[PDB]
């Protein structure tokens, strides 16, 4: 967890990704690695 995430930018989330966010892939379990869309 974490270390398989964070490569270029993505942010650990609790839960579900926020709106301006997409889950690019899993920081832990729950804990979503949202990557902005901007």
Known sequence: SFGLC?????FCARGRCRFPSIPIGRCSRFVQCCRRVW
Do not use: E, K
């Open 6 to 10: 964070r490569l270029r930018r993505g």
